[model samples]
Target: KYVKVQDFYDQLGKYVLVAPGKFSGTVAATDLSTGWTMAWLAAWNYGDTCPIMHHMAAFPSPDPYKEFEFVVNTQGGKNLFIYGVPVTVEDPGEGMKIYRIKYDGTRMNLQRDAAEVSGLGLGVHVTITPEADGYAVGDGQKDICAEFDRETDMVRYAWAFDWDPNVKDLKRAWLDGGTMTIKRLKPTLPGGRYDLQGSKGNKIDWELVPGGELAIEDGKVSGDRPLHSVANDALVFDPRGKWAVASMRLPGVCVVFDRENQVPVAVLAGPKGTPSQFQLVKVDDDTWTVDIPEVISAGHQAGFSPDGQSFLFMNSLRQNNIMVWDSSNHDDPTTWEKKAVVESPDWRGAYPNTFHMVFTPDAKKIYVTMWWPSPTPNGIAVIDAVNWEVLKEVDLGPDMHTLAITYDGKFVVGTLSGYQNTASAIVVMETETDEVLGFLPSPMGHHDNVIVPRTLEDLRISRSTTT
Candidate 1:
């Protein structure tokens, strides 16, 4: 039987899907009335975070389709270099039509087309907004409502790279006989790293750092300012709620901002006295070194412990260790000291391309996603939290890059995003037994994954230590 949003809106209650990335393996469902999150569902794949809607079945189920079935993609084909954001969804009788935004429109209105969802998949069936220049105002393109069935997985609407022939330039459009529409990008600059969490009653806090520098509240962009003007790989909040830290890939620094007042409190150049660590070096009074290729040390992912006492960060290109810092004085970034460095496992005889790290609910174990290049993916690495040591490595599938754990810490999900080879799958694992459950096929590779937080406690227990 086909299920639509309205069919479950009455029974399950109304909610809104929030996030900037288009396709994701897991999605968060936020309450419409309070903006508080309801649950996170396994859906697509991404390096950036994602969102959710009504529940048709139990969440985080072994059968992902039963958890919350939906087909959310973009017009950019299946490997778009630029990230696409889902904006709206509609059902014009034939099938469910989802709209996505795919351009920053820096020089020109690059968004100029729409994708036909000649469809078949569990998808959203409701009216919403599109985030594009012409589309938000009513001047865009005609609609192409693709039909849906059980077996046909449409490739026409799959996101792809800019050079790909199938890639579609995003534009505003409306479905025929459908009331759904979409909003456009408000800022001209490019937006990069984003993170979300529950702050207080009826308030959800979100931030888009680096270029966009946006602070969002209650599902809307409230204001913007340069908190950190650099290429950022990760943006996250301290678990104890004192600071917001962002990894600056270009400047090779981590900028710390006071969460309450939005002030840059400190700038961590690198681990103390470790000049070998990638950072802006003052080679001469007039010149400084920014990019280091020999060592290839640039911050990629960073996180905080549950108690907010420890901070950890990792470099993606050739760097093989995770550096930990004492975060007791969270407000004073300069006071944070290097505590330890957890090295990547070398037992496989090949370097494991480590990507993201997530801490268990109890804060005792840390799971790090590893993409081993023995030609294919090896698996994930488990770290002992107390001693900061590699405890064990478990095999999964594909080029595993990002990880997400359920609220109860019973299961963990890792997404495979292999660029050199085509391995787009999400591997589900049992945390208690440390066993590989199975793999969920994804239309494209995913770089980021998260279990949406339902409350402030959920934020502390799960997201506070995840990147």
Candidate 2:
């Protein structure tokens, strides 16, 4: 029979045992796939009133752990066992070993036994990734597999920035494993008000040679020719070998240069207004025009189609509309026509404003993300590429902003709200299904522009890595 005790510690604290040496363990409830648990570790007991004598039990749980899966750490050694079978063992000098464990349902007990040891010291660290393989420790190091964190949702955003000193400002952020990297590019002072005194700006007028390949990796800029700067809106190859388009606040527009020439193939000019009226001038051997009467500004994103037959842009000042221009005849401006592919009929009244627009890899659909004053819930609206019609609107919950789609258009990731200065959340979603798979937390801030997922080989040679 269990006997009753007078003190409160005798009731709740009696079952707790202080195993000698550095020892710690965890007990998680069964049945719930994604639930909480408790962790306990033994150490020196200072005094009954000092609150240090008792074995410390971590409360509310860190994340979700599997049933009967306990990890114990001790000063002399560390062990991970399941159902009384040792699965992993770590010795101080010999390194660690991992094995499989077979278990039955219900209760599984783990004990840390040391012979004639006066003091027991233990520190246990556990990370739970649900619906994936468990992390293992080997050779004095930990090999962690990718796992979905059940605690928080995921979000991601991708866009491009024009590294121009004559235009506006630009920045980028992305995830590299658990760490996040943020890079900012500010416009260099031309021979104007912002120009640095006694310092001459670089006069290299690098042009985008026709058919030349241009890419930015790490921080240093490289191409077939030395590039002084690119137009505000430019397209580049993504990490997955897909095309990514972005806009700068400069005068001319630039495509991903494919040839060795350093001049932009397209230039835009118009009378300045609140919502500007501009003409897209395609310059090669001859010049043609694509008149966008509704365009009131120059800092909008534009890019050529995969087949190079049409052009797409977001009219930043003109009702935040996604405008497509027919460029079948590059030499004839009269042939250029505009179509309102995507827009919110009630955005000015209902929503704040929209900025970035990008197409999926196949060019079959388009995705647009919005921005406003405060942290508000933005949306990703999918559109039909052929007819330029709205298919469906996916409401990205509150504090969601920015977006990036994969090369094959399989996944879209964006930023979460709380990631203010240097923290971000990557939300992965299926393109066709529009379902969120999971999230990867990032440590970078202001990752609103430019995401190009590169292949493993390309990533290894990327300039971004060195910088």
Candidate 3:
């Protein structure tokens, strides 16, 4: 039998995969939706904060795909470097056809959303006009029905980097009538970074390989992506709701859903300061502006529970610990205030700490990483969503980095950062038991770790966080 997302719910915390941002063991997963985001978030191994996608970052059983347990390095062949994670986007079997996202586009017609025309309700129904001269709309790539996985392994299409004259660019590649067609890139930019232009405009900045060539084997090219360096590794999404939020490495940011309108109600900006605070403004249907008087040292990431009843945020600077705000009283903007602190000295570090968080599908418990290095109790902390108390901690040895929680809330998987200029292994633990199951070593160090399960047990057909 093939692997399914619920299988982990059956096994006793048997972890299948890991992070992709590090030089060591990195992995990625895929979702039913497409475009630049899903396949991107499906897998991550970054130093920057990666919002947890519950059913993502996992593995398959029975090896139906003939895939290997480990992914190879990009330097070894062609691979997609999504947020630094090199991945193969080629789907196997019968060599399926790739379709384009036309005018009506795959219109996820979210009119019925929260479920009305696309059952994959992972808060992906938000519309992005793509902006003038922007990435999505720019270059008139609307033909991009999905520059990602096409619904299933049999129907695959995605963005791939290629070499033209060996001095290449990106190509909208896919299979057509048992043959392949690639709307490939031609002008390759010279290496280096920029705020705009040169195609490295997104949060994760990367350039097409100069003189990089896509290799072909048996009339097929390996679905490899070309990218470099790491900067914009920020992402946000909801696996169940219809709310959307995204951020970059800045003073800090957040978004709130009014729930009633089923749309983004507010936008929050974190200005770095002696203590940073979230300035909430209005957006779309949920038009309301509110001010959160309290301040944090450095706001790295913020999120709302699946039900939108409570809100949680954390700063990477270790200035303050994890804080929660009960949004049930969401109607009163001014009434929105801190409900409880998840971690008292959340910044418990010999140096400023790193924070990565995830929640059980029920949204009742939160699993966060204190993200410390060395003899520092570097571990994962569980926060009781109802009481907001630090229930317990699981020591992870050295540098604690990214973390992933199984949807069933049975186990927690974490990657080691090796803080002392070294790379460690991935750690696994029993959720309710606080039991340190074991550690598996990586070649180098890792950053953004994710577990993507192949089975569509629950994620029937979802949309991308960023269309």
Candidate 4:
């Protein structure tokens, strides 16, 4: 019997990253339906994105810890600070140290020569100059954002700005010996939360109370608010107070699956920059019969809409090559047609040659990545799918030409491969906060990523209104 749609919808879907050129053997998960696991340790040459089917059932399991299964190579490989100062964390067995990117092709680590500094994590402090600060990030030289906490094993500060900051173009920030600085303690008559709302998370003027880093006073810091710091970065606010923390939506990735059966769908390929004008026949759900011999390349990344209808792809290695093919007709794979082939306009410092793109859960917005960064600002280029226009370039710093949204939908994890030489980190940003969450170090050029299987509520609403 053919698979039932409701059964597919109820089962779990799973995906993983494959780096054949880097690791020894492929590390896999035994149970994709449960949590992400290192089912095996057979590494690879460290390549790109790797997705598995919900039914890939079992591989191997000389696995690892249950909690950190999703942990990949956190190597601080080569990076791009073209647009602003990158937020870097160092772990040479010394301590956690932070630094600002002084210029291009500059691989400098701002580490403390003393001893072991970070364990829980570091660099999160050292306040980043937000856009409101005329800030850009090629890295930093930049500011005094935080201190290391002994108890929590993380780097953070008390009374944070409740908002993310930019720290790129502050040339005069650190005057030789004067040292640069920025803090969340910035307050005003209207409160320095132009990007946040309410009060608890905003204008947090801290008053030293019962006394120490781990100590907490009864929240009375003037406005009669009950807020106290537990770890320099952790806090407790009066439950009923108007905490000024802002809420941002997590960016979603596109998924391709059968609407009725709820099973995953496969991507079709051709041998040309554009779809090969060949007669393609469907042999089965997993195999295709191609009659035309075209230029079939495999360096580009791809994505599918969450509802599993339309498809998107880009060759980050070429110029004038971004495509969108659709199969909205009866949800059949063989019915797909090259629907849209939009061109990326060549703006000033940023030239739109090729990169990556993915559809949101709502299948409304398709976020794109671009390269040739440095001369100016560029990051993820957001496109409004309704009319399909380049809306904005966000999280400007590196020429992020790859896409990988976290499974939880908390961020838009942009990947880069500065020409297959310098391995840049996996840069992150909160979809809702629009805050730069930093990047994954060591492994670079992992230009592609995918982890889908989104909710169907939006898909339901989407189908109800389509033409």
Candidate 5:
């Protein structure tokens, strides 16, 4: 079912970084040749609510928690400044309290009404300057603006502005100047969560809360980084561009987004239900599948098979289960059915939990990455696609996290999301024998890995839309 990958060096290239445990909204660009981090781009602070739910929804800044709307380059071709509203918890909605931040990390403030400035004359023009003291608005400027200093490491600086709503047929708005900093919170275990044993009556089970740790790295600050509401496991697309599936750990569910509008059209929760709205899949149809009404944990990755007929959802931490779904009807999510629940092999031990899974292009076998909080053979679980059976389990190493198959289906690339004392690395294996070929040195911890396409012919397998 799998072939071997040769010439691993030529296939490697640049990699992207997103630390679900570290910063919520920041993304790092890195050179894979050396694993050196190039730069960190501060996307809007990690957003919480669904963007489509809000009318101001738009790409890049789709998240309602977005503070930075857009950026503007100085007239002299100097530095840059990001334009957005004040980022605060009280106001969780987007496009509110508009603001800006200069390249040097200085915040500018805007005034609402031109009439408020005494002695202001019409047609007064002012040139925008690069310096912090430069006030671009002329006395005739009918809108709003202000100034402030950079306070914390997360948000360097910011400025506020009021728009004359009449210009856009919108209502006028205003925001006052205030100093605030972003909070730093540690991330839970690599699994994001864990479970505890129960005792009482049928004995009450305690799915206790697991602890977290900040990724060990230089210049790493706790809360200053952007915050995303859920620890998104992975975002994958079906064979066609019509749908996008993202499995989130914190939410304990998978979000199916309509590709055309990027709105979450459907959500899938595991045996342990979800807080957000979701449609339940049929589990009673199969005798092997039992409906566990008391499950709380969601899955780590929800992805489609090459044929696009089956959607595999991998539960994390204590559940250690995989639920297969019939996904023939994408337009109507209700038609999706819970096909089977593949439980982990008992030989793997008590805490064995699934992380990521990849299928052979032929759709014959599935390779799932396994994780365990306690000492155990944490590696890859080979499942028979036809029978939904755990055919075999192979140990690659500790923290076996994500799995990526070559477009040819000859090889599998697995990643290690190491924690605490463990060392993280990339594992290369021959698909046919599921044998370890070698390991690539990686930064302490990384959650995802992908192969970059080299030519146009590769688009079918490379691009998420077509894949």
Candidate 6:
């Protein structure tokens, strides 16, 4: 069977109203026949500003004639913004007012105050100008002034002031209110006495001393002269801090510098026997002299004992013949004593291609680098400073060139080549136990000797702190 349904609420009616009068009180109400109840809808009074409009509001006027400017206050050290731009308004006096305002009195007109800002004594004043695409300024505009551009969004600021008396022209820049100045120095020549400035650059500025026979063929130090030859070794200050000694490669000699007068006072073992040699020369202020039967042809490296009373050198031919001369009693040359001879064939043969010698900060123990030729394993040998006995020999795989120890003598850093393009690795080791701690890959081709404690200090501190 099929069924049909009827439509409900077919008799409902709709109404509309059109009125221009104000309705201040409740006006209409309605009630429903169902259990769900309904209530009246009320309208409240409103002013003429509250209206029903068809179109949206327009933007405010764009003052195309208005200009922009800024005032710089040098005393307050703070920048003030006028018209959304920064200006220097440092310590403007309590009553001082400087600004750029519009001509309509609704905005500021760019102006500088005649009275100084309070508490700002004799500060500089500056005027700023905004150009079509960039900005410019007049002179005496700021303690420091900058021109900025919108295209690149870049700014360049400049300061005008008299150079300070203490400020060095080529060495330092101004900082910290121009009260402090920095020092800059350059590197010294190879094998020259120098004073490390420890400043802007880690370079030693040298003061060359006279003497030690710079062969003067025509009033100039030349290598062609019979007695003159270039020195390959480094100049080291004596442990006593009284003199600096340099080893020459051509003459095979040791030249001594008098620390007080900054002059070489003595030359020992110069070109007497072989093309290369070693000798000990004593310098007393300006006087220079050497004893006979000098320790000749004793390798190419030399250094003084901590007391400066003795000298140490490596022997080229001997297996463990590291010669030591006791110069405590210079009056009697026979008083010179050979302390010990290190006889380690394995260690000596390791670095046959390069000169080998041990070095130490306090001369308590000598740490030596021993590396076999290419394709061979490398090793390091440590010896007792007093007896010259081999205390430890560490085999450092292959392709190792040089090694360094920490200032505290707790870690060793070794470099291995051929890992990267000039690849190097810092193989850290425990100095006391002679155990490999770990390894870290160093930047390519970064090889340097003479462990620089100051450089390490700067690197460690710079990572953790700010200047």
Q: State the lDDT of candidate 2 residue by residue for 175-222, as single tens digits.
A: 010111111212233321111111012111111111111112122323
lDDT of each: 0.40, 0.30, 0.35, 0.30, 0.39, 0.31
Instruction: State the displacement of the C-alpha of residue 361, model 6, in Å, after optimal TM-score superposition.
Output: 5.7
Off by over 4 Å in 6: 1-230, 263-298, 304-310, 317-321, 327-337, 347-362, 397-402, 417-423, 450-467
Across residues 1-467, which tens digit of lDDT does each residue of candidate 6 receive?
55321111111111110011111111111111121111211111211111111000001113212222222111111112111223344342121111111223133232322111111111212212111232211111111112223233233222111112122221121110112111111223343212211111111111011121221212333122212122223334344344444444322345544434444444444322322222333333323333333222224445554445666555442232445556564334334455555656563442442233324445566555554444566656777877767787776655454444444455555555432233344455666666775554333222222222222131111100000
Top-scoring candidate (TM-score) = 1
Q: How many clashes in candidate 5?
A: 21
User: In candidate 5, what residue range of length 10 has the lowest lDDT sum?
Assistant: 73-82
Which ranges in model 3 have alpha carbons more than 4 Å from their true place?
A: 1-15, 25-199, 202-233, 256-265, 269-296, 328-337, 345-354, 373-377, 419-423, 454-467
* C-alpha-based local distance difference test score of model 1: 0.40
Off by over 4 Å in 4: 1-277, 281-299, 315-319, 347-355, 372-378, 395-401, 417-423, 433-437, 440-467
lDDT agreement of model 4 with the native:
0.30
Candidate 1 residue lDDT tens string, 222-258: 2121111223343356766556564544233565655
User: Native-vs-model 6 lDDT?
Assistant: 0.31
Write model 4 residue lDDT over 1-467, tens digit each, in one string.
Answer: 98544342223334332221121112232222343232333222222122100000011112212221111211121112111334242221111122111111122122221112222212111111111111100010111122222232123321221111121111211111111111232323242212111112312232121111111122233222212111121111111111111100000011122322322233244213544123433444433322222222212333345554555444222223455666455335545666675555553222543434555556676666655544344477767766656766664554454454534444555555443344455565665545675554424344333332222232121111110
Q: In order, what is each prediction's RMSD in angstroms?
A: 17.6, 21.6, 16.1, 25.6, 19.6, 33.3
Per-residue alpha-carbon lDDT of candidate 3 for residues 212-274, written as tens digits (9 for 90 to 100): 112111222223332111111223333334333433222234543322233334444333342
Which candidate would rank higher by TM-score, 1 or 3?
1
> Candidate 1, after superposition: displacement of residue 171 in Å?
38
In angstroms, give how far residue 4 of model 5 lies from its true place: 18
Candidate 5 lDDT tens digits, 1-467? 56433345445433222121111222233333344443333334323121110000001112212221211100100000110223234323221111122211122122121111211111111111111112221110111111111121111111111111111211110011111111111222243211110100010011111211011011121222212223333345566446656444433555565534423456666543332235433222211111122234434556677667888776655456887888878676656767777875573333566656777767788888777653455788888888889887777666666566665677767667454235666677777887786786555344444443222222223223111
What's model 5's TM-score? 0.48
RMSD (CA, Å), candidate 4 to true, equals: 25.6
